Structure formats: structure tokens, C-alpha cells
Amino acid sequence: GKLPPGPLPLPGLGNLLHVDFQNTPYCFDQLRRRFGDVFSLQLAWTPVVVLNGLAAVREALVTHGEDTADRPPVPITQILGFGPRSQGVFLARYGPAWREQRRFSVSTLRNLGLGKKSLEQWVTEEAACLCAAFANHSGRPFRPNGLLDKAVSNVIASLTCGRRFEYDDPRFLRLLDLAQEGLKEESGFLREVLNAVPVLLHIPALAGKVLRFQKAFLTQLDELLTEHRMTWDPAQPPRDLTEAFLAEMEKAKGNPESSFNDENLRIVVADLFSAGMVTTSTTLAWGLLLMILHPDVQRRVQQEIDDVIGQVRRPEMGDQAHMPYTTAVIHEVQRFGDIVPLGVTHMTSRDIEVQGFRIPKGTTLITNLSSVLKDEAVWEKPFRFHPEHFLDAQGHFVKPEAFLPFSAGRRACLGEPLARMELFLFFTSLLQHFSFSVPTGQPRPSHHGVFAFLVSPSPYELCAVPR
Numbered sequence: 017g018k019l020p021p022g023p024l025p026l027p028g029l030g031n032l033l034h035v036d037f038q039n040t041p042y043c044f045d046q047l048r049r050r051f052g053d054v055f056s057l058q059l060a061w062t063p064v065v066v067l068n069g070l071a072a073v074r075e076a077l078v079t080h081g082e083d084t085a086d087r088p089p090v091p092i093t094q095i096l097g098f099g100p101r102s103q104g105v106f107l108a109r110y111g112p113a114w115r116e117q118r119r120f121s122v123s124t125l126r127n128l129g130l131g132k133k134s135l136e137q138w139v140t141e142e143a144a145c146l147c148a149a150f151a152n153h154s155g156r157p158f159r160p161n162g163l164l165d166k167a168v169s170n171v172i173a174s175l176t177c178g179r180r181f182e183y184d185d186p187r188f189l190r191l192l193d194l195a196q197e198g199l200k201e202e203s204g205f206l207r208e209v210l211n212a213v214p215v216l217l218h219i220p221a222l223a224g225k226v227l228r229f230q231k232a233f234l235t236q237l238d239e240l241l242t243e244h245r246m247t248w249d250p251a252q253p254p255r256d257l258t259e260a261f262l263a264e265m266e267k268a269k270g271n272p273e274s275s276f277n278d279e280n281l282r283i284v285v286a287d288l289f290s291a292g293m294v295t296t297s298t299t300l301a302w303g304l305l306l307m308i309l310h311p312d313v314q315r316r317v318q319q320e321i322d323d324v325i326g327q328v329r330r331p332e333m334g335d336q337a338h339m340p341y342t343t344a345v346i347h348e349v350q351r352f353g354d355i356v357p358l359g360v361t362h363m364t365s366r367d368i369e370v371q372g373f374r375i376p377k378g379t380t381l382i383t384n385l386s387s388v389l390k391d392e393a394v395w396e397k398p399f400r401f402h403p404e405h406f407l408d409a410q411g412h413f414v415k416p417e418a419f420l421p422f423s424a425g426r427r428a429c430l431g432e433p434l435a436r437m438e439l440f441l442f443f444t445s446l447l448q449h450f451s452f453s454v455p456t457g458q459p460r461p462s463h464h465g466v467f468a469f470l471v472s473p474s475p476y477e478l479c480a481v482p483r
């Protein structure tokens with residue numbers, strides 16, 4: 017068939033000069049309007065095809081799901097100890113090493129969500145610690161980003177290591193700092209050359225520079241995992257994900273085919289921290305910003321909280337089914353926030369057809385999730401913060417098919433259930449105890465995000481006064 021249309025590639029630079037990596041989302045919307053829902057791009061050495069709109073995204077990730085579940089190879093991961101049997105989950109090539117870990121994480125999260133419901137208890141407890149930290153600001157204006165990062169990070173810590181860290185723990189803070197620096201190493205021209213020409217990794221200066229923060233991150237992680245290994249009681253059922261992994265590691269001793277080994281454990285835990293911290297934290301940061309920019313919505317949320325939960329009792333997941341408006345608001349925060357505009361890249365493992373065009377095997381697929389969440393043909397006013405995008409005239413919560421912030425198909429966010437829990441419990445707990453507002457004498461913060469691959473709220477401060 018015909019290959020997707022797009023800007024004519026430059027002789028050597030290809031379409032690199034046709035893409036603004038500072039505002040890639042805006043740039044891609046421009047290309048979409050010009051070339052259609054499915055367009056091509058030759059970014060450096062990689063042939064790329066961008067998918068816009070729900071139809072294109074689903075046809076690729078769902079209809080042709082078996083052929084689009086792979087990730088583009090990333091040579092530099094060798095630096096982090098990657099191997100055929102240890103690829104973590106996030107960037108693991110489609111195959112058994114990924115599927116065994118995918119199934120393990122999914123079932124493990126599900127299990128920690130049943131019975132005594134450990135996950136919900138850890139989250140509820142963290143929300144209380146978070147509220148107390150907000151109160152310590154005594155009404156003084158502050159940037160809530162740091163605390164949101166710590167609260168969300170502690171939830172992953174609870175899930176993986178069965179513990180939390182005090183907000184002033186040296187090790188915890190170093191870990192968070194390394195995490196934010198590490199995210200940056202996902203961009204840059206250096207990584208682009210090294211991945212295209214892996215032999216350049218033989219030069220110490222370069223190999224030791226591309227992922228210095230991510231390597232240090234893993235090193236800090238090793239220290240924590242080693243301590244956990246000492247406290248693990250194998251005679252009791254696994255209390256957290258690392259214990260379940262260790263138990264599986266023991267059963268796999270002697271099996272060279274297993275993905276349960278020391279090299280993979282550190283990668284899997286690092287992946288959960290990496291994929292689950294900045295996302296959930298940035299979403300909550302958008303949440304509070306939108307609440308001070310739209311006080312009316314905030315009051316309506318607080319009125320539903322008071323009517324369903326009261327001002328004493330801690331919010332519970334059971335309350336969610338009875339708070340359609342708060343659910344609508346949280347969903348609109350994600351839709352409007354659009355924190356992962358271009359999702360995570362996929363790679364075709366077989367020629368496929370999308371919207372009639374031919375997609376050669378080995379093509380890197382970019383899912384423009386932003387084009388789905390902001391589609392003008394689906395949403396009433398995609399560019400406004402409008403809770404009613406998820407409510408009907410009767411006030412019932414309705415979730416359009418276009419709500420795909422976690423993507424779709426076999427590789428769709430495995431943390432979605434936990435993210436939903438964290439967003440509801442952290443948001444409601446905070447709105448239940450505080451009234452948030454923009455600090456006087458300060459300009460109304462912008463609703464425009466700052467793109468750095470991940471889309472964050474423009475820097476802002478706020479006052480949290482007890483209710």
C-alpha cells in the first residue's frame with residue numbers, strides 16, 4: 017500500500033529540521049492538520065509514523081495489537097545491565113522476558129489490591145502524611161510539587177519495598193533528585209548517536225555520561241533493595257512486590273530462561289518508580305493548579321466530599337462510586353493536563369495497515385495521545401478545563417472512548433489501577449482538608465503546560481488554608 021504522507025525529508029537531516037522538540041505536541045498538531053491523522057517523519061536514523069485520533073491509535077494498538085506491542089531497540093540500556101532475560105518491563109522488547117514481567121506486575125498489583133487491601137491502606141496513610149505536611153506551611157504560599165513527588169514516591173516505595181520514607185530522609189531525597197535528573201537522559205542528541213552507533217560506547221567518556229543519573233539512581237536503589245533483602249521473611253506470604261519477585265527468584269534458581277534474576281529485579285523496581293512517580297505527581301500538580309484557577313469547581317468538589325464523606329472520616333475507594341462530580345473533575349484534570357502527550361513509542365514487528373496506509377515492519381510508532389484527549393470532534397471544548405466533558409445533563413459520570421491517557425493495547429499502562437487509586441484518594445483527601453487559592457499579589461498562573469517530553473504545569477505557588 018501507500019506510505020503515510022508527510023513533510024519532504026531533507027537530504028541528511030531528514031525531517032529533523034521539520035520538528036520542534038521544544039513544543040513537539042504543537043508541531044505535530046500542525047503536521048496533522050496538514051497531512052492527516054497518519055503521517056511520516058524521518059527523525060535522524062529512525063523512520064517514524066505518527067498516529068493521531070482515536071481511530072488510528074486503536075487500529076494500530078488494538079486491531080493490530082500483536083504486531084505493534086514491541087519497543088524500539090535501545091542499545092545504551094546495556095549500561096544498566098539489560099540482557100535478553102532482564103529487560104524490566106517498560107522498555108522490554110515484546111517477547112517472553114516482557115510478558116513474564118508484565119503478567120507478574122499486573123497480578124501482583126491486583127493481589128495487593130485484594131484481601132487486606134494493602135495498596136489502599138498505604139495510599140490512605142500517605143494522603144494523611146501529605147495533608148499534615150501541607151498544614152505545616154501554616155497558610156504560607158508554596159510550590160506543592162516537591163511534596164506531591166514525595167507522597168507519590170512513597171506509594172511506589174510501599175508497593176515495591178513495603179515501607180515509606182520520612183519527607184526529610186536523606187536517601188529518599190537523593191533518590192527523588194536522581195529520578196528527576198534521570199528523566200532528562202531520555203532526551204538529548206548524545207543518546208541518539210550512541211543508540212545509532214553502539215560501538216561509540218567503547219569510549220568511557222561517552223558510556224559513562226549518557227546515563228550517569230540513571231545509573232546512580234539504580235545504585236541508590238540497590239542499597240535499598242539490599243536492606244530489604246535482609247528484612248524479608250520468606251516464611252510469611254509476600255508483603256510487597258519485591259518479596260514476591262524474590263520468592264519467584266528462589267523458585268527459578270537453575271532456570272536460565274527465567275526473567276526473575278538479580279539483574280532484572282533492580283530494573284523492574286526502577287521502572288515502576290520511573291513510570292509511576294513523575295506521571296502521578298505531575299497529574300496531581302495539574303489538579304491543584306486547576307483547582308485554584310477554577311475556585312467554583314473546587315467548591316463543588318468540596319461540597320460533594322462533605323455530602324458523601326464528611327470532614328472527619330478519611331476518603332475510601334468505596335466513596336468513588338458515589339462521587340460522580342469528583343470523578344469527572346479528576347478525569348478532566350488528566351484530559352486537560354495531558355501529561356504524556358506522545359505516550360511511549362512502539363515498534364511494528366510486521367507490516368501493517370492503518371487508515372489504509374502501509375506501515376513497514378520495524379517502524380517506530382508514536383501515539384499522539386494528546387490528539388485523542390484534545391480531539392475537537394469528540395470533546396465539547398477540548399481546550400478548556402471543563403468537568404462536564406465527563407458528566408451528562410443528569411450529572412451522571414460518563415467516560416468517552418477518547419479518554420486514553422494510559423494508551424491502549426497490550427502495552428497500555430499497567431499502573432492504571434493504582435494511578436486511579438492515588439489520584440482519587442490524594443485529590444479528595446487534599447480538597448477535603450484545604451481550600452486552595454492563588455496567592456494575592458501574584459499573577460494568575462498560566463494554564464499552558466511546559467513541554468519537556470512530559471507536560472508539566474507552569475511553575476506556581478498556592479496557599480492551603482484548613483477548612
Ligand code: HEM
Nearest residue numbers: 106291292295296299359360422423427428429430431435
Ligand atoms: C497519572 C498516571 C499515569 C499515566 C498518565 C501513565 C501513562 C502511561 C502511558 C501513556 C504508558 C505507555 C503505554 C504504551 O506503551 O502505549 C504507560 C506505561 C506504563 N506504565 Fe504508566 N502512567 C501512569 C502511572 C503509572 C503508575 C502509577 C505505574 C506504576 C505502578 C505505571 C506503570 C507503567 C509501566 C510499567 C508501563 C509500561 C508497560 C508495558 O510496557 O507493558 N504507570 N503509562
Ligand SMILES: CSc1ccc2c(c1)N(CC[C@H]1CCCCN1C)c1ccccc1S2
Nearest residue numbers: 106107195198199202233283286287290291
Ligand atoms: C529514574 S530515570 C527515569 C525517570 C522517568 C522515566 C524513565 C526513567 N523511563 C525509563 C525507565 C528506565 C529506568 C531505569 C531502568 C531502565 N528503565 C527502562 C522512561 C523512558 C521513556 C519514556 C518515559 C520514561 S518515565
Ligand SMILES: CSc1ccc2c(c1)N(CC[C@H]1CCCCN1C)c1ccccc1S2
Nearest residue numbers: 037040059062064203358359360361380469
Ligand atoms: C521512548 S518514549 C518517546 C515517545 C515520543 C518521543 C520520544 C520518546 N523522543 C525521542 C526518542 C525517539 C523518538 C523517535 C525518533 C527516534 N528517537 C530515538 C522525544 C524526545 C524529545 C521530544 C519529543 C520526542 S518524541
Ligand SMILES: [Zn+2]
Nearest residue numbers: 177178256259
Ligand atoms: Zn518487604
Ligand SMILES: [Zn+2]
Nearest residue numbers: 408410411412
Ligand atoms: Zn445519565
Ligand SMILES: [Zn+2]
Nearest residue numbers: 448449482483
Ligand atoms: Zn480538616
